[PDB]
Amino acid sequence: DDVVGFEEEADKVINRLLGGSSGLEVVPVVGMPGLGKTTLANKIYKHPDIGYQFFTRIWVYVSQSYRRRELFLNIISKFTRNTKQYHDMCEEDLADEIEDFLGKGGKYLIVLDDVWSPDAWERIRIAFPNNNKSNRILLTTRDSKVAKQCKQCIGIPHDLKFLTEDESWILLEKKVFHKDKCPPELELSGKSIAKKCNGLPLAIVVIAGALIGKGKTSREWKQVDESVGEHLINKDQPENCNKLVQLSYDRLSYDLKACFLYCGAFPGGFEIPAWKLIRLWIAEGFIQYKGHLSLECKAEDNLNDLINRNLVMVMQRTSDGQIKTCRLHDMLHEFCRQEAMKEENLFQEIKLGAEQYFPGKRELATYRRLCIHSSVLEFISTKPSGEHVRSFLSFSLKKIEMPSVDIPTIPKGFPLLRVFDVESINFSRFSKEFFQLYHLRYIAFSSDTIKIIPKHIGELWNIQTLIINTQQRSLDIQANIWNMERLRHLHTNSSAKLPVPVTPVPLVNQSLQTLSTIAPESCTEEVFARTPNLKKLGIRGKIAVLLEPNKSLLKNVKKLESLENLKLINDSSQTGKGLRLPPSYIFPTKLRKLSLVDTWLEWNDMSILGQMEHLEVLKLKENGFMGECWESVGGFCSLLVLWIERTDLVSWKASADHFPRLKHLVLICCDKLKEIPIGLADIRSFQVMELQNSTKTAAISARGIRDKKDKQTQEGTNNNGFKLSIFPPD
Amino acid sequence: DDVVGFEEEADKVINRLLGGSSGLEVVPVVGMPGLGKTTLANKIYKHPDIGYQFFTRIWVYVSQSYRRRELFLNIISKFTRNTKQYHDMCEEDLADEIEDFLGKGGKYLIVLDDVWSPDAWERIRIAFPNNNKSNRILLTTRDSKVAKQCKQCIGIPHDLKFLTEDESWILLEKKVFHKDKCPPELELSGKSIAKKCNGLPLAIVVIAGALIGKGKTSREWKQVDESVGEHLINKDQPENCNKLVQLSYDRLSYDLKACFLYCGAFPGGFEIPAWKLIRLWIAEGFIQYKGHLSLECKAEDNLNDLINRNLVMVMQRTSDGQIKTCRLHDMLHEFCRQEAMKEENLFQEIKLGAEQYFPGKRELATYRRLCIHSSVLEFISTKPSGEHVRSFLSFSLKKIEMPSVDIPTIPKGFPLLRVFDVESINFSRFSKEFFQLYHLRYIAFSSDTIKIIPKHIGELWNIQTLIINTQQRSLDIQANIWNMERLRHLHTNSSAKLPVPVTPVPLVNQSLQTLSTIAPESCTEEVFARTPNLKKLGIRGKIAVLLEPNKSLLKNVKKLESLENLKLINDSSQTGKGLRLPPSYIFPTKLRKLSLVDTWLEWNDMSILGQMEHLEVLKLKENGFMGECWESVGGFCSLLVLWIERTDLVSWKASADHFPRLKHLVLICCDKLKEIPIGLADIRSFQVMELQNSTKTAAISARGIRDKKDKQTQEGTNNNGFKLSIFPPD
Numbered sequence A, B: 001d002d003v004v005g006f007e008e009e010a011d012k013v014i015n016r017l018l019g020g021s022s023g024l025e026v027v028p029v030v031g032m033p034g035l036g037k038t039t040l041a042n043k044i045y046k047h048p049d050i051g052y053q054f055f056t057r058i059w060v061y062v063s064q065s066y067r068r069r070e071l072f073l074n075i076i077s078k079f080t081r082n083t084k085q086y087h088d089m090c091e092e093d094l095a096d097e098i099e100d101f102l103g104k105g106g107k108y109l110i111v112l113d114d115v116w117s118p119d120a121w122e123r124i125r126i127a128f129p130n131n132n133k134s135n136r137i138l139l140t141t142r143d144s145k146v147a148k149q150c151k152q153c154i155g156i157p158h159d160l161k162f163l164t165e166d167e168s169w170i171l172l173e174k175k176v177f178h179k180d181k182c183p184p185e186l187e188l189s190g191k192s193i194a195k196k197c198n199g200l201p202l203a204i205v206v207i208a209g210a211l212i213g214k215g216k217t218s219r220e221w222k223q224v225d226e227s228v229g230e231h232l233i234n235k236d237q238p239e240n241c242n243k244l245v246q247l248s249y250d251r252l253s254y255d256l257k258a259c260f261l262y263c264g265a266f267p268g269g270f271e272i273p274a275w276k277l278i279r280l281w282i283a284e285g286f287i288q289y290k291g292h293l294s295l296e297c298k299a300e301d302n303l304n305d306l307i308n309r310n311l312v313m314v315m316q317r318t319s320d321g322q323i324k325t326c327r328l329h330d331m332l333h334e335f336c337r338q339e340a341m342k343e344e345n346l347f348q349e350i351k352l353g354a355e356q357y358f359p360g361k362r363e364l365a366t367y368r369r370l371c372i373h374s375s376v377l378e379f380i381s382t383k384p385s386g387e388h389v390r391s392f393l394s395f396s397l398k399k400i401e402m403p404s405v406d407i408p409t410i411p412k413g414f415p416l417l418r419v420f421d422v423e424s425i426n427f428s429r430f431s432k433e434f435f436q437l438y439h440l441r442y443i444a445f446s447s448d449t450i451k452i453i454p455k456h457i458g459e460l461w462n463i464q465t466l467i468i469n470t471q472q473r474s475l476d477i478q479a480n481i482w483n484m485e486r487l488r489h490l491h492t493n494s495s496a497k498l499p500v501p502v503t504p505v506p507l508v509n510q511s512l513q514t515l516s517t518i519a520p521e522s523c524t525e526e527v528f529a530r531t532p533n534l535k536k537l538g539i540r541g542k543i544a545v546l547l548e549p550n551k552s553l554l555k556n557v558k559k560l561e562s563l564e565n566l567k568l569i570n571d572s573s574q575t576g577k578g579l580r581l582p583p584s585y586i587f588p589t590k591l592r593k594l595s596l597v598d599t600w601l602e603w604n605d606m607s608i609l610g611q612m613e614h615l616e617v618l619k620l621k622e623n624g625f626m627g628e629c630w631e632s633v634g635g636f637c638s639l640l641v642l643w644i645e646r647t648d649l650v651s652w653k654a655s656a657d658h659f660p661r662l663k664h665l666v667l668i669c670c671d672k673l674k675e676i677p678i679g680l681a682d683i684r685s686f687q688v689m690e691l692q693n694s695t696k697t698a699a700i701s702a703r704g705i706r707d708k709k710d711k712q713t714q715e716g717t718n719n720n721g722f723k724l725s726i727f728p729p730d
């Protein structure tokens, strides 16, 4: 409930939505960036009354650099998982598909954030039919002319009010002091600050983060108070607010300063993968820690400082509470840009400006880090060359093929390249000079034809992370990854057939921690003997090769003492019944996360999982577990999160003793579940619960469980209210 | 000498060039389009005094849609034939290469036609160094601000004057009446017209063509006189002059109207290949002739009407006088556009306008013929679909690769496609749905990976012309081209291994006329037995397989009675001496054109060629003939043109009886020629003569021959003055 002073505005907006015309209706929210337009939209999205009243709730991100085809793909992905048929149809075809998808449903609302030009609104409006079902469009805009120019915009342009003072002091106190009370010698400074921010929440949260970072001293509070007083916030000039961000930026440590500045190289509206980005922090040497925690731990700590300062906003978190997807505010992105080019020339972006001509070698040679986001193919066709370029950064929501003749240009022009992520570029093959980059550390790309990883990859002695994505069924690795001592991580989407190591000095790879998806045949004794420090393991392929009762290779997994994350993917031609678990003591004594996919195991097998006393997060995906009768056997003494998706389970019996400490519980696509155990509502730690494609009997059992737990909350000191998801509410 | 009234302007421009500053100097020529800027530039280029004074003379075409990399490639192609090393270097690298290439030479001039914006001039000027050698730049522009903005443009902007009336009447009379005298009842109309064109040569030539097309009657002359009087030519509004072109356009026949309008679909500044374009018409059914001449003959007649009306201007002609490269004036191109979209909606062009968004299906479905010239890859990535599209037209000076996943989009979106020329698009493979186009007639594309022509190509029963270009050494054709009765032409750049026909109805392909270079092993008896009407033959590969004395296959060529054009390319691993011709009577009795490449034959072999009494044009390319002593044996009773390039010939003896009727004579890269026969100057028909990379002894022999022939011209009635090329004059 981190929303202060928006209750009246949200209530009046909701009143506008539920009332008004009975046909199509669009409400525009205009305001100076950072004032709370998207935050208010998110509050409206999560409000219970509107969600109950609206059958379908879609969140859409537009941004300035919107792609209509990409946007239509994004909307289509929210309806049908089988997206292979929609990749070929032209844009109006997916527009009609969206039209009929929302036609099949009931009353719906569409949320369009950060629309910059009226022509974009006109081009996207064609996908929303007028079915006289009181469908609503929550449009957010920076300019009132966008709403004014539309004849169909019958609703008056709602100018969202700026934050009131009563909201100010309370908001800033909640942000910076949390549950603490401000000392008297800082209270007047806080009030003066709140009056001096001119009710702009982004400025308030950024100065709160700055105050947290340095210390809660009266002198520093007076300094920031006079600084914000020296910067009057004009209602028509947002750039001065960037100066306030400067008052935060100077307070960060030099390496942390640098990583925050590098965080701005990403495109606006881009949902950053957390794991990818921590790798960018590590590969570039930005993360330096002379302490007991690992470098990845230090990078996670830095991300935690970023989020708690409200500099980087997290949109989706992992099931266990970790950060999954983070992004930067568009105003903060513009400030980071302005700093990057006009102030400290750390890195530069190459964009198709009004001149429509790309920079030549003379200007490019002065760059140190590049970031090409659109029209990359033309730029690489120009064949640039940078002798002082240390990085190549490029993310796009669309995949761009790699011209073969143009392939050798990138390595030849950048011999001093260190990191090179082209995950939006589909490499067709490997060039010889690509193999000459001895200074490379991070390489990640996609391919649709590469089957054999060549031997010469072993001669890159400075690579730290290697990420490969492909649509091929099986991937063969011929390069000697075992002698690559500095290699730390691997991530693959296909079945990776690692070479069988040969036994010959400290050849043991103590730095290798995570190695993503590996074919079952490579999970041998020698492979795990060379990496005792492995923590995350992933197996992809015919799991029957792993888990035959007579010659199961999981005995080798027993000797891996440092393992905590295991992933198994079943790609066998036949995935029928007959699979069973080995004795429970075979597993590592300190494993934490295991995920079973397409295993087709009997329910009783969790008894093996019942022996592990430290299991806390478990995920079942794509027919991990099934069986008509599920009886809870054994006690999961430390289970916190269990995640089951698309199982034909019918009946489940459970008790509080079986799962004494569960916190997160998820069922998805359970088309045959009869009832959820009532006694689960008797567990105090049971907090969050969700349904998807469940039976009506499951729905009424869920409602009864919610009522019982709410009554228990009325009985005991259950501070954390129960969370139930009525999805879909149709 | 078709230049009237420009003698004074050309003389003063030449005086400016030879005089002025001793360093870099740029003369700009500004004027309303069609006034004669490029024509005056061409006259200056071909003037003898400037060519003698200037060591290096380069012609450069810029146009509005100029590409700096393409332009630099074009300039580099004029210096070194080995262009494989220059394809990889970045733009400034070829700029420096051009800098040193002109540095090695002496005083030079660079001609830049049709420069539209000053920034283009600034970006191209960096390739021209200041060596204090009085180098000159003939720049042609439409706006004086382009010259004014340049600080280095010390020379005053020369505003070229409009043609005077005395030149006018003479110019129009030379254009329309040639050597005839205007009747008195049309002379006053001609004078009134010439005064009413306001001295604009393009208008004069177009109305002369219109008058020629309809008839030289007094009433029609009065009609065109009042029409041009009704259209006053404003000096600042060129669009009204387009109306005058209308007075010509309405006078053409409907099919000829249509083909002229289709001629405008090509990009401005594009040098049209004549053969391709007659193929494009013959495929679209535009050429209809109910007469004895072939359809190709009718198309050539139409092109002749186009050129003699000055609607289409020819830049380079074939050695025998035929049209090789033709183009349209930029003002005429704009008029053709205006007519195409705003008037008769015959065809439309898809371009990246200020909106920066490509048309959708709704507008595209109303189109009948398309023409995409730039940013084609984005358009095909959009995946357009046209149910009423009958043609797909795309030429570019650069090669664009074909995305595999995007490959199927083109055929699926255009099932009613008839012609499809993507010769600027590099196809990587064949898609199955591409093979579903049963309405296709003309297909032409380039590839760097296609080795096997698939069988299903035989199921396209409506194909008339098939053109394939590839860099592969050998091309295999598996499709049954023999049962393709409507197929008329084939053109390949690689060795084409045709399938061996099997003997089984009129299966004989009487419509097949030309079939490009074909691998030697396919020149069998059965192949030539199925196409008795063949006229142009081409063989590419190991010619030793064709021409072994014991088992030569040219006996089969004997039975081909309709053959007139033969091409042979030697791609054998060893091309050493030992090759010899068969007896002369083996050849068809009516052959006209033969070309020998890399044959390595003895000189005496022309005795066989001496037997053919109707040989008129012969070309020797890439070591066709060699030998220290060349003695002329036999009499070429009808030889007109002989063409020899890069031979190590030393001594040649010839007489007038050997070549009694030669007209065009060419020697290129003769690094060892001792002397040219003096008696060749005694031949009356000897008119044109050229040298390239010749010896100094060859140069002085050439000068003596020129002096002797000029003295003979002073003796006899040699109306056609002798033409000698001082090339290079360094």
Ligand SMILES: Nc1ncnc2c1ncn2[C@@H]1O[C@H](COP(=O)(O)OP(=O)(O)O)[C@@H](O)[C@H]1O
Pocket (backbone or CB within 6 Å): A002, A003, A004, A005, A006, A032, A033, A034, A035, A036, A037, A038, A039, A040, A171, A201, A202, A205, A310, A313, A329
């Ligand atoms: N009621 C509120 N309580 C706390 N923070 C808020 C509130 N409204 C806005 N904010 C903060 O203001 C910032 C700007 O939010 P957002 O609406 O996403 O951008 P914009 O206002 O430009 O659309 C957010 O980071 C958010 O944390």
Ligand SMILES: Nc1ncnc2c1ncn2[C@@H]1O[C@H](COP(=O)(O)OP(=O)(O)O)[C@@H](O)[C@H]1O
Pocket (backbone or CB within 6 Å): B002, B003, B004, B005, B006, B032, B033, B034, B035, B036, B037, B038, B039, B040, B171, B201, B202, B205, B310, B313, B329
């Ligand atoms: N002195 C001349 N004699 C005959 N025709 C001319 C003369 N000068 C120009 N023309 C004609 O005028 C037309 C325009 O010529 P050009 O110079 O190529 O275009 P622009 O004047 O727009 O540069 C040409 O087709 C040419 O035939």
